[PDB]
Design a protein around this ligand. Structure first.
Ligand SMILES: [K+]
Ligand SMILES: [K+]
Ligand SMILES: [K+]
Ligand SMILES: [K+]
Ligand SMILES: [K+]
Ligand SMILES: [K+]
Ligand SMILES: [K+]
Ligand SMILES: [K+]
Ligand SMILES: [K+]
Ligand SMILES: [K+]
Ligand SMILES: [K+]
Ligand SMILES: [K+]
Ligand SMILES: [K+]
Ligand SMILES: [K+]
Ligand SMILES: [K+]
Ligand SMILES: [K+]
Ligand SMILES: [K+]
Ligand SMILES: [K+]
Ligand SMILES: [K+]
Ligand SMILES: [K+]
Ligand SMILES: [K+]
Ligand SMILES: [K+]
Ligand SMILES: [K+]
Ligand SMILES: [K+]
Ligand SMILES: [K+]
Ligand SMILES: [K+]
Ligand SMILES: [K+]
Ligand SMILES: [K+]
Ligand SMILES: [K+]
Ligand SMILES: [K+]
Ligand SMILES: [K+]
Ligand SMILES: [K+]
Ligand SMILES: [K+]
Ligand SMILES: [K+]
Ligand SMILES: [Mg+2]
Ligand SMILES: [Mg+2]
Ligand SMILES: [Mg+2]
Ligand SMILES: [Mg+2]
Ligand SMILES: [Mg+2]
Ligand SMILES: [Mg+2]
Ligand SMILES: [Mg+2]
Ligand SMILES: [Mg+2]
Ligand SMILES: [Mg+2]
Ligand SMILES: [Mg+2]
Ligand SMILES: [Mg+2]
Ligand SMILES: [Mg+2]
Ligand SMILES: [Mg+2]
Ligand SMILES: [Mg+2]
Ligand SMILES: [Mg+2]
Ligand SMILES: [Mg+2]
Ligand SMILES: [Mg+2]
Ligand SMILES: [Mg+2]
Ligand SMILES: [Mg+2]
Ligand SMILES: [Mg+2]
Ligand SMILES: [Mg+2]
Ligand SMILES: [Mg+2]
Ligand SMILES: [Mg+2]
Ligand SMILES: [Mg+2]
Ligand SMILES: [Mg+2]
Ligand SMILES: [Mg+2]
Ligand SMILES: [Zn+2]
Lengths: 219, 131, 110, 89, 97
RNA sequence: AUACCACACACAAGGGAUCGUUUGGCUCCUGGGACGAGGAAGGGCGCAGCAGAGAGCGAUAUGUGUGGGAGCAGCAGCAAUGACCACACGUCCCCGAAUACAGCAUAGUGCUGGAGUACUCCUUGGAAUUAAGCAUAUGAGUAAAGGAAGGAAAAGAAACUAACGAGGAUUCCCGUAGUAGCGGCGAGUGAACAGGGAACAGUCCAACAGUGUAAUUCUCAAAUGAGAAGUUGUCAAAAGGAAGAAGAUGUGAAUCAGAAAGAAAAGCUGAACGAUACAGGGUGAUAGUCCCGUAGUGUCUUCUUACAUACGGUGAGUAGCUGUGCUCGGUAAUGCACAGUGAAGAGGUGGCAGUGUGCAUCUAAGACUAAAUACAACAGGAGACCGAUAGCAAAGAAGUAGGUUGACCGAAAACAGUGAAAUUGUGUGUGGACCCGAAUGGAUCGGGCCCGUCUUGAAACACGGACCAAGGAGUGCACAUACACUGCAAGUUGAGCAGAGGAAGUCUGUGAGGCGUAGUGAAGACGGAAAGCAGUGUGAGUGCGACCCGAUAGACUUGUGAACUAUA
RNA sequence: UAGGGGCGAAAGACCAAUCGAACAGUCUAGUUGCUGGUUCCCUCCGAAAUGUCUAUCAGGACAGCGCGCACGCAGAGAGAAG
């Protein structure tokens, strides 16, 4: 909308679009402001007042996270997401405390002993450059999802495992649905810490009782 | 992962920083690895290539060749090595430039300030290594 | 205008009207946290907040509820054996505009 | 007639180069510049926002203002021969 | 609508508190007395030096003829307030006596 | 149809679509908010070995000092006697507030002027538009024009609310509320206290200064003197500190080889190794270990901040009143002015005019004040944004080339990639405008008027359309609503805001308000049926540019014009 | 000597190819009951050009005739016989 423009009106054998007032340049007499014009203004310009976020009831958020946690212990769902678990003895996995690990070298040896080798390899081999214009806008590489580790108490193991591709970490008390159901499909593979697994009873309570940690919520 | 928020991870910003570099930052672009023996003769692991030094080409058309560095083009980041050339229709021969990182140093040119440059870097290490 | 509705009344006629968005909400929250933290170091052993009296809310609708007020009165402070200069040094808030009109309200603040 | 033949008589020139602004707009008879109002003390009111931004600070060289910012950054150190005067003051 | 359900009689009820008596401030110290005396004194000297204003003369003249209700109306129109008029009439009356 | 016209296919022309790419734009967040008589901002002119534009710099037109260290892009010459870069300093032509000047203060030195003005304060003040016409009203105390200041500005410690069992400076957020009311009672307009929070801080002058001596400020001398201001009244006390924050910069792990194939391996295949570092960028195809970094760790430099005296209850052309004009939701006057008139020392107020009388709450006509709040230029970080007819007008010497008498107006052009259609030539085939149905070795047979659009009615002697590519029109927000889907249910809820957390996500508290749990009346007053609340979306109404394009007109400027033409 | 103003031996003539009210720029994307245009496929259902009121007659609103979702259900655009 920058330019000085006006319509020539009828009687000149031309369409009555606004035109640019100028002289000495090829720009004289060209068609100015409308959406059907080169260099004109777009239809309904995009605007900051749009509603970016969305609400969801707290009671649904609580219930969805509870049944996402449940699905992490049904083999049919875990396999269905594409985690491969052929070599793993039993689900769920619960690592002890008194893990005194500090180095990544010894950290991987632990994970291999739980049967996770094929799963981890599946992630490392996956790295590829994205198709389309997203590769220009800071979203260049894509990787497959792998195990999530959940802890509750501060331990050295967290900074021993984190550089291994596809390993992900969160605390039990603030466990998110984006981490528990990626892409909106449920049944992510989870490594529990022994403290964290016991805490699930305080957090979600018992059937037909009220949780002390989540006020006003019952299963 | 990066936890410092003052350093950029934008593709657009990293690329501009590369090509518009000047001064000492430009010199950092001309670094090459030293061979295993020289890494015992001197403390350093890598140095900026200069005329008169002796290099093995480890990638490309001229792989396996050895020779003396003739010239260093800073604007178009390339090094000319003695005896790496192409012949035109005329029979005339033109030296083809190689990117620094495809080379490896075999003998160092010790003319001029090189001995002081090396000393300055060794001291900078030890100062913090021994602490 | 057609059909049955509550008759419109939407006030968007004025062309000089300003809009205020709230995209800064999470960031300004983080700044307020960091200012309190550093303020808390400057006076380390002492609480960041002062002590305040309990008063009774205003109308017929809120009579039966008690709330924090602005400051203790010279009479409350004196009855508890302190002096005004000392009270300030120990982190008690003072308000010389307030008056005492009940026995009960005085006894509780003491 | 008012078209082509009247164009032949157009050999006088009412505006010359202004000494304040360069813009070939000083009207000799009126004694006034149509771009910048010379000889009035203040500069003229510009007609619109588009036209005034074409002549703002930062459209030219800003020689003095740039140096001042660098000196402020450095802590106004002054000429090193004369440090004792600075320090006393 | 959660408005206008009680009658005016029941809205007038109140809780039985125990009150505190007001602390009277009647004592006036020696220095405060001299302060007030000097101000009242100064007000005498001004009246002695400069005399009465035109409407005050016209007012006092009406008081001698017992034109009480005329004087009242006159003073109301000059000062605006019926209270100020009642006060100024009483001060003028006392001056004449 | 030998050669014209049309169509199909192959090759050569002609043009620049499409796909692949991007040292640019845009949006949000955080920091910053740094000019001038010591000559600014803006304009002109000069300076290179070969030098037009642009960049850089002033006749010192690549000088000095500090920290580094290898080349100067072409050609000729230079360079460890220091190429080039980074930090500071020195030098800095002419015009311009432009001043050998104007106004003004002090014992004296001096100060102001111009630039910028997004955000803040003070004045002045429209019309288009809506009311389906229009004059009060609306748009709007908005646009435009003037004055002024700072990193914020303004405001600020009750001549304040309230009628409770009361509270207690100012500013900001949630809310009371599209309510009480104002209104050709039409269109439309429209606040306050409470209740929940962020941040918190109070003080000065006058009234009212030692009289057994102006004890007070300044100048010159001197080691104790002269003089100026002032009795129309001067003079009312502490050093001091470690914390807190922002930058700059050093260091920083670990790889080799091969068949086939390619211009080139980093791919693929086997064997290893690092990780508190698998963020991201560069290398001749897709790299943790080839190069620059990153996680982790060192140093250094700046900036911010902190103890003393004496006091109260009368601040006048003011408050108020009469008339008048503007203004506000303020209504028998909410605020502000002008003219007449004009107080008391005791006065002001308690949303409806007057008079009286108790009761409650305050103290005007002098001043200062932090934090929590707003937003350009310039710098830094991010993104479900745009990808060269897009995104800023501008991805190159863009406010440029160029243009107006003037105020002012204003383009195109990416890769030495790919290479579509319109349109042209040559060769080879098939037809005489072309489509649909059905066939021959071969003449052809049957059916069909030119599309889009307003219209009772178009093949029309109704209008738009020469041809091809690319662009090109029901969208966003607020408020009620009916339906479909989801959780809980006499209840329900992501208000703001706090606590946790390598964090614009998520989890947990505290805790208002709103609507519902039953209605009737203008009201006093009375009382007796019917599941709701909050979301995710769809159809639809109203207001904002409101599906896209289009008037003749109206207003406003401290903007321009008598080079053509009129008259002195 | 400059725009609701100038200048005119008067024609509403002339004031930079513009004058029964100049030019530049802004408010402004002024308004429009009027003209033009409004971009993919198949399946199923399917109108009205009438009445009342209107500064109403090239426009609206309310009702009548379509479609979608449908709680439910003895009815019918035809005859007899009184
Ligand atoms: K415009
Ligand atoms: K928080
Ligand atoms: K010009
Ligand atoms: K100015
Ligand atoms: K000024
Ligand atoms: K109208
Ligand atoms: K209309
Ligand atoms: K306006
Ligand atoms: K202030
Ligand atoms: K103030
Ligand atoms: K208040
Ligand atoms: K409060
Ligand atoms: K390294
Ligand atoms: K290889
Ligand atoms: K390489
Ligand atoms: K006072
Ligand atoms: K007055
Ligand atoms: K005050
Ligand atoms: K353009
Ligand atoms: K030009
Ligand atoms: K090309
Ligand atoms: K080509
Ligand atoms: K038509
Ligand atoms: K016909
Ligand atoms: K027509
Ligand atoms: K709409
Ligand atoms: K228009
Ligand atoms: K004449
Ligand atoms: K004419
Ligand atoms: K006019
Ligand atoms: K019409
Ligand atoms: K049918
Ligand atoms: K009709
Ligand atoms: K209807
Ligand atoms: Mg555009
Ligand atoms: Mg694509
Ligand atoms: Mg002439
Ligand atoms: Mg002239
Ligand atoms: Mg009532
Ligand atoms: Mg009561
Ligand atoms: Mg009209
Ligand atoms: Mg009005
Ligand atoms: Mg208004
Ligand atoms: Mg303005
Ligand atoms: Mg005093
Ligand atoms: Mg590549
Ligand atoms: Mg008004
Ligand atoms: Mg009133
Ligand atoms: Mg492209
Ligand atoms: Mg463009
Ligand atoms: Mg010309
Ligand atoms: Mg007809
Ligand atoms: Mg035509
Ligand atoms: Mg298209
Ligand atoms: Mg409501
Ligand atoms: Mg009921
Ligand atoms: Mg439009
Ligand atoms: Mg009009
Ligand atoms: Mg009809
Ligand atoms: Mg028609
Ligand atoms: Zn000028």
């Amino acid at each position: 909308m920058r330019h000085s423009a006006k319509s020539w009106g009828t009687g000149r054998a031309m369409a009555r679009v606004p035109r640019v007032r100028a002289g000495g340049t090829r720009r004289a007499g060209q068609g100015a402001n409308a959406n059907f014009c080169r260099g004109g203004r777009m239809f309904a310009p995009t605007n900051v007042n749009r509603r970016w976020n969305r609400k969801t009831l707290l009671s649904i958020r609580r219930y969805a996270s509870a049944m996402a946690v449940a699905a992490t212990s049904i083999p049919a769902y875990v396999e269905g997401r594409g985690h491969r678990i052929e070599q793993i003895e039993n689900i769920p996995l619960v690592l002890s405390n008194k893990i005194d690990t500090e180095k990544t070298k010894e950290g991987i040896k632990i994970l291999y002993n739980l049967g996770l080798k094929e799963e981890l390899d599946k992630v490392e081999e996956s790295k590829n450059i994205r198709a389309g214009k997203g590769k220009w806008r800071n979203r260049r590489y894509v990787l497959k999802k792998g195990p999530l580790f959940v802890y509750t108490s501060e331990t050295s193991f967290t900074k021993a495992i984190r550089n291994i591709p596809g390993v992900d970490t969160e605390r039990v008390e603030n466990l998110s649905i984006l981490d528990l159901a990626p892409g909106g499909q449920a049944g992510r593979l989870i490594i529990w810490m022994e403290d964290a697994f016991e805490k699930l009873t305080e957090i979600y309570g018992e059937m037909n009782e009220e949780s002390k940690f989540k006020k006003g919520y019952t299963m | 992962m990066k936890f410092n928020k003052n350093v950029t991870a934008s593709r657009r910003k990293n690329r501009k920083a590369h090509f518009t570099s000047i001064g000492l930052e430009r010199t950092k672009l001309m670094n090459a690895p030293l061979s295993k023996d020289l890494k015992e003769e001197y403390g350093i692991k890598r140095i900026a290539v200069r005329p008169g030094d002796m290099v093995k080409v480890v990638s490309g058309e001229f792989k396996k060749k050895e020779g003396v560095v003739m010239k260093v083009n800073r604007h178009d980041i390339k090094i000319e090595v003695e005896g790496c050339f192409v012949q035109k229709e005329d029979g005339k021969k033109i030296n083809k430039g190689i990117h620094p990182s495809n080379l490896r140093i075999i003998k160092l040119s010790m003319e001029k300030d090189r001995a002081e440059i090396i000393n300055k870097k060794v001291e900078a290490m030890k100062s913090e290594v021994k602490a | 205008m057609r059909g049955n509705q509550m008759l419109p009344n939407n006030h968007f006629n004025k062309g000089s009207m300003k809009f205020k968005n709230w995209f800064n909400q999470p960031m300004r929250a983080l700044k307020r946290k960091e200012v309190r933290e550093q303020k808390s170091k400057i006076c380390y052993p002492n609480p960041l907040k002062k002590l305040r009296p309990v008063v009774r809310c205003c109308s017929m609708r809120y009579n039966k509820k008690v709330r924090l007020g602005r400051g203790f009165t010279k009479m409350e402070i004196e009855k508890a054996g302190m002096d005004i200069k000392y009270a300030i040094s120990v982190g008690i808030a003072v308000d010389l505009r307030r008056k005492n009109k009940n026995e009960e309200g005085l006894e509780e603040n003491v | 007639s008012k078209g082509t033949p009247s164009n032949g008589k157009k050999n006088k020139r009412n505006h010359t180069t202004c000494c304040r602004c360069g813009s070939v707009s000083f009207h000799k008879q009126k004694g006034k510049c149509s771009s910048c109002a010379y000889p009035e003390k203040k500069m003229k009111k510009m007609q619109n926002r588009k036209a005034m931004l074409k002549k703002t600070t930062g459209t030219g060289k800003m020689r003095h203002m740039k140096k001042e910012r660098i000196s402020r950054r450095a802590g106004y150190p002054g000429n090193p021969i004369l440090k004792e005067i600075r320090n006393k003051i | 609508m959660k408005i206008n359900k009680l009658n005016n009689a029941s809205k007038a009820l109140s809780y039985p508190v125990k009150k505190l008596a007001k602390t009277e401030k009647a004592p006036l110290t020696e220095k405060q007395q001299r302060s007030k005396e000097l101000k009242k004194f100064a007000m005498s000297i001004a009246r002695e030096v400069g005399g009465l204003a035109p409407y005050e003369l016209r007012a006092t003249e009406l008081l001698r003829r017992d034109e009480d209700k005329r004087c009242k109306k006159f003073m109301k129109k000059r000062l605006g307030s019926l209270k100020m008029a009642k006060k100024k009439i009483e001060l003028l009356a006392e001056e004449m006596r």
